[PDB]
Design a protein around this ligand. Structure first.
Ligand SMILES: COc1ccc(CNCCS(=O)(=O)O)cc1
Length: 658
């Protein structure tokens, strides 16, 4: 099934190219496919790559175009004034610009299908929109079309949306090629996907990537599998993991490290229109923000994450309560029974539910999976599913029973509606994970729980010490274990910020010397240092030479194993921008032995300064390359919510960075 037109090596230098004679008489029938391989490493603010237009006076709104923005957004317009049709379909963050200094060849496939009345856009093997309409407009059927154009749209005789870039290949087909045929078109991607829409997680969205290189050489990744769009909360989120045994070349089908069953794992297309985009799965328990470390001694992998019950709500839930009760220097999980107005129960020794009014135990116990048992018998609740069939989000029982968990909305016994920290382990390097256990309160019975810093924990090289960074108001709270994560203690480190999202990651500069880099509210990345393996912490300093936004973004960090320019090296991954989450960089710092100060000497731009880059994970691969898994979009922006397959992985060598 051949192209009706095929052309290549077009240079778009703010001057459109007329291909009308070559293409227009070839166009026929009402279904078309455009395949285009193009580069744009210096795009204009808004530019059309391809246009079919009525160029005549008075018909300026009769055209089809494929356009892009310098934010990385791709879209089409399909307009006919006589038909009263003005379609615009687009998706932010769909493009690559540059990789290792070279312009990326993006592969774009646009399918206009008259039979299904559907327009579908793929970029780099990723479907970025699929839109069905009541009234279909074939792109060839726009009234009075007389121009086919590359690198602009001809309107009333003038070049609109002038492009800068190149089209190394463009093909057109008088057919809507199938999704399968699309999948056979060769790609030139600079990235790969570890987690993706339609995989075993069945989440359509992903956020908060982590990466960690295990001692066997296996590289492990964890991530938020996010079901209700990309929202933090309220939502349904599980923690998924995947691993690579060949230095990041291929990755295992994901499994769950932490999951709840009160709501079905559904692949859902979350609305992106302004009226509905803030719809939230509101009755589901959820995890969020994971962190990984490996323990030399037991050989176990440890994964922590925040846990939230279904009853959680932002503010007034639950600052001023840890969710635990202290009774004799020991902490016990509090529980409220269906119909009580306060928390009159605790989960004492061996999950026995006690009544704190009468100190009498009950016939109810809580098992290992935080599930409710009555007289030894497994209680259940009915699962929920969500849908937008009514034109707004509904959450409804689906007929399926699942074990009753104290984190669920429908549970007989409920935990305090606050945030907790959970821990699970794997003894097979990520092939399976245990049931999670809740960590105890660290800042007291009355303090709500600290917030886990997503990314990596720190395994000190010269001892058995494990450290996970967490944050809360006014300090970082480091969690320290010297016994394979069986027992934890805290080390508080004051920071000059109140209610900051002080996401912190650590590197060991040398034996027992830890530097922690963290997110602040000042527009600069901060850091502090410990010289006694985390017991005590220095005052806070800031990095100059890198800019963040006022609200800041997570920073990932590693100690590189090899010397660079003869010096110890640390590599930071972060957006470099004071406007938004974009301009991703790896910044290579060299340590000064005189004082452990760091000279930030090399900045590697991940992609264009204007292209999205948010939360990130980096790890030194066993072959000394650098693996980077990152949110390739602006995960703060209210315009880039609910995008699929934007968390992407790349492989880099140190020479690429210098
Ligand atoms: C336990 O519940 C939690 C835990 C952490 C958070 C913060 N996540 C910030 C991400 S962002 O800066 O908005 O992109 C929100 C809810």
């Amino acid at each position: 099934i051949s192209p009706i037109f095929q052309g290549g090596s077009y240079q778009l230098n703010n001057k459109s190219i007329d291909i009308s004679s070559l293409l227009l008489d070839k166009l026929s029938g009402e279904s078309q496919t455009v395949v285009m391989k193009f580069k744009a490493d210096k795009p204009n603010s808004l530019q059309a790559l391809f246009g079919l237009s009525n160029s005549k006076a008075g018909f300026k709104n009769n055209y089809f175009s494929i356009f892009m923005r310098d934010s990385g957004e791709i879209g089409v317009e399909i307009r006919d004034a006589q038909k009263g049709i003005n379609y615009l379909f687009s998706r932010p963050a769909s493009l690559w610009g540059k990789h290792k200094g070279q312009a990326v060849e993006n592969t774009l496939v646009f399918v206009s299908d008259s039979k299904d009345k559907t327009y579908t856009m793929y970029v780099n093997g990723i479907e970025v929109f699929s839109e069905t309409v009541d009234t279909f407009l074939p792109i060839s059927n726009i009234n009075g079309i007389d121009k086919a154009t590359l690198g602009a749209v001809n309107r009333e005789g003038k070049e609109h949306y002038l492009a800068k870039g190149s089209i190394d290949e463009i093909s057109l087909f008088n057919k809507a090629i199938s999704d399968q045929e699309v999948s056979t078109i060769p790609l030139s991607n600079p990235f790969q996907l570890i987690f993706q829409s339609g995989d075993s997680t069945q989440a359509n969205y992903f956020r908060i990537p982590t990466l960690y290189t295990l001692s066997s050489g296996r590289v492990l990744s964890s991530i938020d599998a996010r079901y209700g769009g990309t929202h933090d909360s309220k939502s349904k989120i599980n923690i998924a993991t995947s691993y690579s045994d060949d230095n990041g070349k291929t990755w295992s089908e994901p499994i769950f490290a932490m999951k709840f069953n009160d709501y079905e794992e559904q692949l859902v297309y979350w609305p992106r229109d302004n009226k509905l985009k803030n719809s939230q799965i509101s009755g589901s328990a959820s995890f969020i923000d994971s962190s990984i470390v490996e323990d030399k001694k037991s050989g176990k992998t440890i994964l922590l994450a925040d846990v939230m019950p279904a009853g959680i709500g932002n503010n007034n839930a639950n600052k001023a309560d840890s969710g635990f009760k202290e009774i004799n220097g020991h902490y016990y999980l509090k529980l409220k029974k269906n119909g009580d107005n306060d928390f009159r129960y605790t989960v004492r020794e061996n999950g026995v539910v006690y009544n704190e009014t009468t100190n009498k135990p009950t016939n109810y116990t809580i098992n290992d999976k935080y599930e409710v048992l009555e007289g030894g018998k497994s209680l259940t609740v009915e699962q929920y599913s969500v849908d937008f069939d009514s034109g707004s989000l509904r959450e409804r029982h689906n007929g399926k029973q699942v074990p009753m968990n104290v984190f669920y909305k429908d549970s007989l016994f409920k935990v305090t509606p606050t945030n907790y920290i959970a821990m699970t382990t794997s003894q097979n390097r990520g092939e399976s994970w245990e049931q999670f256990k809740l960590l105890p309160p660290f800042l007291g019975e009355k303090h709500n729980g600290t917030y886990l810093c997503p990314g990596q924990g720190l395994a000190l090289k010269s001892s058995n010490r494990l450290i996970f960074a967490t944050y809360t108001s006014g300090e970082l709270t480091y969690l320290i274990s010297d016994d394979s994560g069986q027992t934890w203690k805290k080390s508080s480190a004051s920071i000059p910020f109140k209610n900051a999202t002080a996401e912190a990651q650590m590197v060991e500069l040398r034996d027992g010397v830890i530097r922690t880099f963290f997110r602040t509210t000042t527009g600069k990345i901060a850091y502090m240092t410990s010289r006694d393996s985390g017991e005590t912490w220095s005052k806070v300093s800031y990095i100059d030479g890198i800019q963040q936004t006022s609200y800041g973004t997570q920073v990932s960090a590693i100690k590189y194993s090899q010397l660079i320019d003869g010096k110890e090296a640390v590599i930071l991954s972060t957006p470099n921008s004071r406007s938004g989450r974009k301009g991703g960089q790896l910044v290579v710092g060299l340590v000064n032995k005189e004082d452990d100060s760091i000279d930030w000497k090399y900045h590697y731009d991940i992609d264009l300064p204007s292209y999205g880059y948010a939360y990130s994970a980096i790890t030194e691969l066993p072959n000394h390359h650098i693996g980077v898994l990152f949110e390739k979009y602006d995960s703060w922006s209210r315009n880039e919510l609910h995008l699929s397959n934007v968390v992407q992985y790349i492989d880099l060598e140190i020479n690429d960075l210098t």
